[PDB]
Amino acid sequence: RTMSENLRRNLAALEAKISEAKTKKNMLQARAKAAKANAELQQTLAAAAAAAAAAA
Amino acid sequence: GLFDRLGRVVRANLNDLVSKAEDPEKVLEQAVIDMQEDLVQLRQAVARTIAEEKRTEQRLNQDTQEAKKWEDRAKLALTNGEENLAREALARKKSLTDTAAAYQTQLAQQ
Amino acid sequence: GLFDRLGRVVRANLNDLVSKAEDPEKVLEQAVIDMQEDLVQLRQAVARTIAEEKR
């Protein structure tokens, strides 16, 4: 019965850090998707706007 | 390599002849039409950064109201004398306030 | 790419010639007719927000 209090806390502490890792996963993946889009948009627009205007 | 340079010269001579064939005045207004749609592409991406900025602010409001919920569960545990459950609720509250500071930092950058 | 820019210039030259062909005064009243039906589209959607609010 003393062991089962210890196991019931260890089981709750394990799912608590699994739960934490899952919320972190969503936020980290979101930042990676956003950063991919920011780089492509900024570089593509700046290059095209300089290039077409100068040629014309 | 030498044959790459010679290859690009025969290809460039034909491409330059085609560039001579179109009127520079017509190509200059086509370039302004093209440049106007380039601004159309930029506004869509920029507007989506505003949507993404607001999405991190939504997550911040979700995690901060979840922290208030857990604080109410901690208060309930303390009036019920279950101090062990109050500490458990405070641990959930701490991870929500620490990630809220990360989202505040992300939102400041955005 | 270079051939995309050259391609849009040959296509734009033909499109600009067609834009020169129509009278700007007639196209300006066609634009007012078009703009009046644009307000017709907005009122239907706005009225449906009132219906959704009531729901």
Numbering used by the authors:
A (entry chain A): 112 to 167
B (entry chain A): 2 to 111
C (entry chain A): 2 to 56
Mind quoting what the paper says about this structure?
A prominent member of the PspA family is the vesicle-inducing protein in plastids 1 (Vipp1), also known as IM30 (inner membrane-associated protein of 30 kDa). Vesicle-inducing protein in plastids 1 (Vipp1) is critical for thylakoid membrane biogenesis and maintenance. Vipp1 appears to have two functions: in membrane maintenance (that is, during heat or light stress) and in thylakoid membrane (TM) biogenesis and/or remodeling. Vipp1 binds to negatively charged membranes and membrane binding depends on stored curvature elastic stress.
Moreover, by replacing the hinge 2 region of Vipp1 with ten alanines, we generated plasticity-restrained Vipp1 assemblies. The resulting variant Vipp1 dL10Ala indeed showed reduced structural plasticity when reconstituted with membranes, as it mostly formed type II tubes (69%), including single rings (27%) and stacked rings (3%), and type I tubes (2%). Therefore, we conclude that the mutated hinge 2 region is a critical element for the structural plasticity of Vipp1 assemblies. While we could reconstruct most of the structures formed by Vipp1 dL10 at low resolution, we could solve the structure of a subclass of type II tubes at 3.0-Å resolution, presumably because of the reduced flexibility. Outside of the different diameters and helical symmetries, the structures of both type II tubes were similar to the wild-type (WT) type II tubes with the monomers arranged approximately 45° to the tube axis. However, the dL10Ala monomer models had an overall extended length and showed less flexibility in the hinge 2 region, especially in single-ring monomers, which also explains the observed larger diameters of dL10Ala rings, as smaller rings require stronger bended and less extended monomers. The type II tubes have one continuous approximately 170-Å-long α-helix formed by α2, α3 and α4 presumably stabilized by the introduced deca-alanine stretch. The monomer structure of the type IIb tubes revealed another unique feature of this assembly, namely the fractured structure helix α5 that is split into two separate helices while still maintaining the canonical ESCRT-III α1−α3 hairpin-to-α5 contacts. The 3.0-Å-resolution structure of a plasticity-restrained Vipp1 dL10Ala mutant revealed the amphipathic positioning of helix α0 with the hydrophobic face directed into the tube lumen to potentially interact with hydrophobic acyl chains while the positive helix face interacts with the inner Vipp1 ring or tube surface and may be capable of interacting with lipid head groups. Our 3.0-Å Vipp1 tube structure now reveals that D5, R6, R9, R12 and E23 of α0 interact with three different subunits through α4 (R170), α4 (K174) and α1 (D35) to hold these helices in place, thereby aligning the interacting subunits and helices in an orientation favoring rings and type I and II tubes over the PspA-like assembly, in addition to described lipid interaction properties.
